């Protein structure tokens, strides 16, 4: 639980998507809390609250609030609570995605309408709606951040409809940046490499072929989130920053990496 710097001192923000200590949302929470941020964590509903409690305790988080990002009334209530507790907000982190697991295993061309719309609602639209509700609380400027992946830009096998959803999200970041920039609110994404069967293969491929010859870590993603959410990042908006050990630059499997 050790705080190690003061880069986020005096900044208050909500992180949406921390359900365990292995996730990207957790890596970001740990990084900003270690730099003095005052954080609220969300949990899906009362039934799943006891899972967030100890994560909040280790971070030093004192405010946890219910939020189901597919439910407009739940999101509205969450911001009402933050408004009452804090009056203003400095940052929002949106680390939530959803898509049908079985359709990911199939071909993209076989995607069903229901899965397409559900995935788009949770993975893409929720960010826009959340941004709309955060705006009146972010009077003194601030920073809103979401997460993406290289499958938004190039075809990654079995990422299917999530690639399409993340492409939509990356575009939404740009349109949001224009709307919210009038209030000095930045809007950005981190395009993260995979962090350590299908998943094992993608992770190994990234290890073998990335320029740094390692996988992305939670600490890497936390560092980038600190840039974007602190005063260091005041001049960057509408951007998708790759935090993937350089994988995005590679146009072909390394000649001396093994095929797998």
Ligand X SMILES: NC(=O)c1ccc[n+]([C@@H]2O[C@H](COP(=O)([O-])OP(=O)(O)OC[C@H]3O[C@@H](n4cnc5c(N)ncnc54)[C@H](O)[C@@H]3O)[C@@H](O)[C@H]2O)c1
Residues annotated catalytic, as ranges: 149, 159
72 contact, one of ligand X, a second copy, none, CB 5-8 Å limit per kind:
a second copy
Binding mask 8-47 for ligand X (x = CB under 6 A): ---------x-x------------------------x---
**Helix 126-134 × helix 160-181 angle, to 10°:** 20
7 contact, one of ligand X, a second copy, none, CB 5-8 Å limit per kind:
none
**Collapsed DSSP state (helix, strand, coil) of residue 119:** helix
**Gap between the terminal Cα atoms of the chain:** 40
What six digits make up the tokens of 245? 């050990």
136 and 144 in contact (C-beta within 8 Å)?
Answer: no
- The CB-of-214 to a second copy minimum distance in angstroms stands at 27
How far apart (Å, rounded) are the C-alpha atoms in residues 97 and 241?
Answer: 18
Answer for which of 36, 63, 68, 202 binds ligand X (CB under 6 A) is 68
Q: Which residues are annotated as a binding site?
A: 17, 68-69, 96-97, 166, 195-196
**Helix 72-86 × helix 126-134 angle, to 10°:** 30
Choose between 126 and 215: whose C-beta lies nearer to a second copy. 126
- The CB-of-60 to ligand X minimum distance in angstroms stands at 20
Choose between 102 and 255: whose C-beta lies nearer to ligand X. 102
Could you tell me which residues come within 8 angstroms of residue 148 by beta carbon, excluding any fewer than 6 positions away?
A: 166, 169, 170, 189, 190, 191, 192, 240
Residues in contact with ligand X by the rule CB under 6 A: 17, 19, 44, 67-70, 96-98, 122
């Amino acid at each position: 639980s050790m705080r190690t710097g003061m880069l986020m001192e005096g900044k208050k923000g909500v992180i949406i998507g921390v359900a365990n200590d292995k996730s990207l949302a957790w890596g970001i929470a740990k990084a900003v809390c270690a730099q003095g941020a005052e954080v609220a964590l969300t949990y899906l509903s009362e039934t799943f609250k006891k899972r967030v409690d100890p994560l909040a305790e280790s971070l030093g988080v004192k405010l946890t609030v219910p939020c189901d990002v597919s439910d407009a009334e739940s999101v509205d209530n969450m911001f009402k609570v933050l408004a009452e507790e804090w009056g203003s907000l400095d940052f929002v982190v949106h680390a939530v995605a959803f898509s049908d697991k079985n359709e990911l295993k199939g071909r993209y061309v076989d995607t069903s309408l229901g899965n397409f719309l559900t995935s788009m609602h949770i993975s893409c639209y929720s960010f826009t709606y959340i941004a709309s509700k955060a705006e009146p609380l972010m009077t003194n400027g601030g920073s809103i951040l979401t997460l993406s992946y290289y499958g938004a830009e190039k075809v990654v096998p079995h990422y299917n409809v999530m690639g399409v959803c993340k492409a939509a999200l990356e575009a939404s970041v740009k349109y949001l940046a224009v709307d919210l920039g009038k209030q000095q609110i930045r809007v950005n994404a981190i395009s993260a490499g995979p962090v350590r069967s299908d998943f094992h293969y993608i992770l190994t491929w990234n290890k073998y072929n990335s320029p740094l010859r390692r996988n992305t870590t939670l600490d890497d993603v936390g560092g980038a989130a600190l840039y974007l959410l602190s005063d260091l990042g005041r001049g960057t908006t509408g951007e998708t920053v790759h935090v993937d050990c350089g994988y995005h630059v590679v146009g072909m499997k390394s000649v001396d990496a093994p095929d797998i």
